């Protein structure tokens with residue numbers, strides 16, 4: 001017994017998460033969400049999306065020396081939310097101006113020339129309220145595309161377009 | 172001016188469903204939630220879970236003459252909640268004493284010999300979070316096993332064995 | 343058992359109860375009878391007692407969100423009995439240990455410093471005979487005060503006192 | 514280690530409690546607190562209140578076969594808090610729906626006509642604050658009175674009135 005919710009977020013264990021070593025808390029109620037893409041391989045079943053999830057925490061951790069997988073949360077084309085660092089700690093996903101005062105969610109794959117399936121987007125907007133319900137995120141929050149806060153092609157052109165049409169999106 | 176949610180549900184159009192013809196509604200808010208299985212094939216891709224969702228609906232409609240898939244909400248082994256008749260329409264899931272006063276949710280496949288995947292209980296349990304949040308269910312909704320209200324083994328031995336734990340189970 | 347029997351209860355429809363939404367059944371014959379009080383106002387007329395019956399249900403179903411008023415029967419001081427959940431359905435009046443195995447009759451008044459009138463008693467003793475006559479209660483049924491199975495002053499010092507003299511009373 | 518944090522509760526041994534036999538746990542952090550009153554005599558000295566604590570346990574354990582005194586904590590009008598089942602152990606003060614998910618504090622007395630003193634009221638707040646600094650209560654915990662969740666006059670008009678003015682109060 002540790003989680004009885006929330007937007008049916010996969011807890012660290014089901015995807016084989018090596019224990020975070022991160023120790024900088026984020027300051028709930030955060031004001032920003034940054035959307036990004038892993039520019040990684042994509043996955044469409046919960047068995048490709050767990051393996052691919054534990055693939056990026058390991059690059060971040062085996063190779064980059066990081067305390068934990070960079071993104072606050074992760075999202076696959078299979079269509080569920082993967083717990084990363086969470087609401088509480090600070091992520092490493094948008095450089096030093098934003099990392100502290102935002103939450104980062106990353107879609108799992110490259111989105112320059114493909115978009116993700118609706119469930120993927122549905123899984124995200126959900127984490128959204130179930131995270132405002134928690135008070136991690138302000139009622140009135142601003143959403144930003146990775147490339148809006150850092151010079152990168154993240155989250156891909158096709159995934160970018162979509163998030164521009166989100167009500168909480170704000171350049 | 173207070174509620175804003177709730178859930179990640181594969182909508183009818185998304186599983187390529189046939190249109191309902193059903194017109195009887197339930198008085199909101201519903202107090203019971205009866206659980207069940209399909210005793211059909213199971214699926215672990217979203218892809219073949221939109222298929223099973225469909226076959227289940229097909230049987231129910233084309234063979235039993237029904238006005239829809241009989242269940243308010245279904246569940247796939249891809250760890251997703253599949254919409255059927257939804258929160259407002261009456262189901263054909265548990266006979267004429269219980270159908271009019273409850274919401275019936277049914278897992279897909281046959282569950283005498285497989286306890287179902289863990290995400291699923293999260294997905295389903297989270298779906299009940301919605302009903303409440305929407306005022307589809309009573310905050311104090313009561314969860315019944317199918318076997319509790321019909322003379323049945325269903326939702327499957329393994330699985331039943333599970334639901335007895337929930338925080339809202341009276342029998 | 344061919345020609346019976348009893349009948350002194352005022353039916354729901356007659357005191358204009360709201361629809362009971364309960365579905366949990368007692369196994370009959372029922373061994374134990376639990377005597378409680380409403381801890382509110384007494385009534386002395388069918389009219390008053392029809393309302394008083396009304397309020398209690400309102401408190402149980404309106405406020406507390408229940409399926410029906412708790413008791414199986416309520417005794418008014420106007421000398422008549424009020425069909426609560428009756429003989430075949432689980433009361434909610436003495437906790438999960440006793441509700442499956444008892445009917446709960448509860449006097450509608452406050453009996454800490456008042457004796458309920460002889461008619462109310464007559465009514466109550468008379469109601470039990472009825473239950474026996476029907477196989478609703480075991481012929482050797484055990485009566486118990488509310489305070490005896492639960493922490494409360496129900497059914498009152500002056501009343502508790504009386505039912506401790508009842509032929510069917512048990513420590 | 515070394516931060517604070519909480520106490521000023523009279524422990525079990527001190528008020529000479531019978532050794533508890535209760536197995537069943539609670540899951541922290543608990544969200545709900547239900548305010549009850551013992552509906553008995555009040556005590557205003559460490560001497561008598563320790564007396565009370567025991568009478569009440571006796572009632573529940575020697576007279577009802579309960580594994581432990583029903584409450585998690587009691588408050589005396591001596592201004593002290595009496596350790597009951599505590600933060601970690603499911604108590605028996607409000608039915609099988611509130612018991613597993615809440616914390617039942619009982620004021621030792623009867624506040625239908627009487628009001629509690631300042632130091633009783635302060636002890637209780639302090640005790641909830643305590644619960645929070647320890648992660649036994651949820652920082653945004655809800656307080657409910659005993660007549661909000663079960664049919665009863667507990668915890669006394671004048672005191673019900675007061676707890677409704679509490680910041681954590683929720684009808």
Ligand SMILES: CCCCCCCCCCC[C@@H](O)CC(=O)N[C@H]1[C@@H](OP(=O)(O)O)O[C@H](CO)[C@@H](O)[C@@H]1OC(=O)C[C@H](O)CCCCCCCCCCC
Nearest residue numbers: 311434435436437438441605606607608609610611662663
């Ligand atoms: C450990 C014993 C406590 C001792 C206290 C003494 C006071 C007793 C007064 C009358 C007794 C009555 O409470 C006993 C009872 O029958 N309780 C619950 C239950 O018994 P079952 O035998 O298991 O069917 O049957 C009911 C099911 O029909 C069940 O629900 C009842 O009590 C509950 O705990 C349920 C809650 O009270 C339901 C209301 C809360 C749900 C949310 C709405 C409230 C508003 C708050 C916002 C969320």
Ligand SMILES: CCCCCCCCCCCCCCCCCC(=O)O
Nearest residue numbers: 004005006007130133296297300303
């Ligand atoms: C209101 C019912 C109480 C818990 C049932 C909610 C079902 C799980 C869905 C979670 C979304 C809303 C948050 C619920 C709180 C439980 C989880 C938590 O607080 O960490």
